[PDB]
């Protein structure tokens, strides 16, 4: 058989929420937190054979003898610097558990505060920050020994983050401290606020603060009487000019890369618009946007989203290609291969696997995203998928016509969106592995035991039966980076209902053989719509059945055309 089921693990677990981490440094370690929606109880599991088997380690999370009482894990944290180490915060007690060895050994520690929210440094593996949210003071804490001892470094804090290397020096911290106005002022220290000399105000009386790569952002409120601020390369913050006749109510940073910023602007009228810096020219108007305030506040979403967001997708591996949703009353999708320079209607596929659709008539391909999905109640449905591991490969759920229907299919383009095909009729979970070399999908709704997969960019599909009995499926995932050919199917057996189930599917033999240079082509988004200006990617030709390795290192060449 082309596909092996590497492991079937029936955790005897009835928790509704499942959080999964891959240590993933070629360590076959996988950590899983089973818990309640956001908590009454929890169970932590761990695999060392890459999901072949799972050891339940909840009993190792205790407060010692003389204190039998069971613990409840709210969240668990990983070190971005050292995948060996993890931290487990109790939800109710001011207590931790630390690990330096892939959870083979844990140490129960008391802490001065409840571990509501922790932030681990990306480089200094022993260094982290802590926050007590339901503490009247809003205290911020620091640890140098990876969470064993703590000290308090600030009070009345609204938000905070680490600096961003290399832009900010090591130990840099940005925070919003609450002002009696109810507003906040943004600080920056390197002495962890033990030194006034290194403490440094960067803005005054600001509504919100966002740190993004080179740029920094913040909304200043100016109340006039007669009836946003930007940093660039850390140069002091100055307000940006906007070309409008209508007043502005809400700001949102859609995408940040050096030299071009995408900002959604929602007005009094509840119309939302898109601007681009380098000073903000108008790119696109009436973009589907939400804020709690809010542009779409009245509706359903309010009970689902507390933080604003917009139907605006950046195709990840690329520069310049985005996909957004437009609304009037009434949803439609538009794509730009320029960074908002021009926009376009998404050309529907040429067949079904045939069908008629034309831009002049008024119909185009329409892709359902995060926001539009909640409105049509597509709670579990997939947002647009695009990853740097597979440049110019996009899979999405959407419809063909003049409007996003309730009826939706799966659409694929290995053309950065310029050309689409109809891949799957229903809605499916989907993901991919081996740097886009292989695509798996599973049907949403009725319980299945079919794993549809494809090696030629969705052109054809094959079915693999992964279970003798059909199971409900809650998710289909890969180790991030999508280099492996292992796919994890999360699901539950039929009644007795809701017993978590983790199937580990291994699809190398679908690919079969290591790729050679014969199966590689050069390709730039320029090739698709142009030539126009570039970045050139080596891609496996679509019809090549083989695998680039897990250690595949995609060669990208940047050039002045």
């Amino acid at each position: 058989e082309p596909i092996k089921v590497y492991g079937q693990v029936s955790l005897n677990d009835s928790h509704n929420q499942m959080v999964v981490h891959w240590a993933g440094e070629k360590s076959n370690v996988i950590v899983a937190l089973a818990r309640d929606s956001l908590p009454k109880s929890s169970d932590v599991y761990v695999s060392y054979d890459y999901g072949k088997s799972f050891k339940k380690i909840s009993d190792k999370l205790n407060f010692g003898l003389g204190n039998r009482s069971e613990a409840v894990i709210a969240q668990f944290y990983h070190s971005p610097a050292d995948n060996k180490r993890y931290i487990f915060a109790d939800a109710y007690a001011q207590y931790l558990w630390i690990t330096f060895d892939f959870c083979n050994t844990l140490q129960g520690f008391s802490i001065p505060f409840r571990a509501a929210d922790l932030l681990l440094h990306s480089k200094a593996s022993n260094l982290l920050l802590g926050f007590d949210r339901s503490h009247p003071n809003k205290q911020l804490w620091k640890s140098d020994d990876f969470g064993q001892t703590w000290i308090m470094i600030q009070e009345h804090v609204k938000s905070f983050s680490w600096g961003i290397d290399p832009y900010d020096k090591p130990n840099t911290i940005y925070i919003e401290r609450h002002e009696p106005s109810g507003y906040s002022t943004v600080f920056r220290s390197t002495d962890f606020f033990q030194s006034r000399e290194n403490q440094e105000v960067i803005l005054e009386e600001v509504r919100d603060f966002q740190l993004r790569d080179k740029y920094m952002f913040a909304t200043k409120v100016v109340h006039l009487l007669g009836s946003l601020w930007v940093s660039f390369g850390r140069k002091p913050m100055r307000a940006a000019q906007f070309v409008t006749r209508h007043p502005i109510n809400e700001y949102y940073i859609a995408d940040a890369s050096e030299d071009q910023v995408f900002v959604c602007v929602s007005h009094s009228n509840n119309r939302t618009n898109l601007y681009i810096s380098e000073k903000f020219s108008l790119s696109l108007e009436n973009v589907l946007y939400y804020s709690p305030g809010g542009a779409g506040s009245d509706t359903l979403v309010r009970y689902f989203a507390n933080e604003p967001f917009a139907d605006f997708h950046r195709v990840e591996g690329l520069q310049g290609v985005y996909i957004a949703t437009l609304i009037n009353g009434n949803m439609r999708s538009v794509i730009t291969f320029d960074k908002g320079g021009t926009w376009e209607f998404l050309q529907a596929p040429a067949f079904t696997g045939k069908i008629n659709c034309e831009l002049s008539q008024g119909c185009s391909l329409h892709l359902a995203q995060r926001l539009s999905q909640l409105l049509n109640l597509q709670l579990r449905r997939m947002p647009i998928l695009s990853k740097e591991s597979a440049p110019g490969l996009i899979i999405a759920t959407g419809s063909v016509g003049k409007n996003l229907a309730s009826k939706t299919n799966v659409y694929i383009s290995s053309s950065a969106g310029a050309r689409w095909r109809e891949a799957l009729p229903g809605p499916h979970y989907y993901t991919w592995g081996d740097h886009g070399g292989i695509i798996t999908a599973i049907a949403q709704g009725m319980e299945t035991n079919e794993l549809k997969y494809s090696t030629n960019e969705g052109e054809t599909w094959k079915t693999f039966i992964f279970s003798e009995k059909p199971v409900f499926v809650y998710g289909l995932l890969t180790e991030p980076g999508e280099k492996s050919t292992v796919f994890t199917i999360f699901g539950s057996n039929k009644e007795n209902v809701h017993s978590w189930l983790i199937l580990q599917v291994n699809a190398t033999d679908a690919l079969g053989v290591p790729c050679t240079e014969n199966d590689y082509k050069l390709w730039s988004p320029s090739d698709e719509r142009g030539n126009e200006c570039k970045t050139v990617f080596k891609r496996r030709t679509p019809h090549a059945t083989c695998f680039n390795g897990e250690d595949f290192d995609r060669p990208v060449v940047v050039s002045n055309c």
Binding site: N16, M18, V19, F472, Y474, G475, S492, V497
Partner: peptide, 7 residues
């Protein structure tokens, strides 16, 4: 049963 998350 509800959902599965990364992170």
């Amino acid at each position: 049963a509800a959902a599965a998350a990364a992170a």
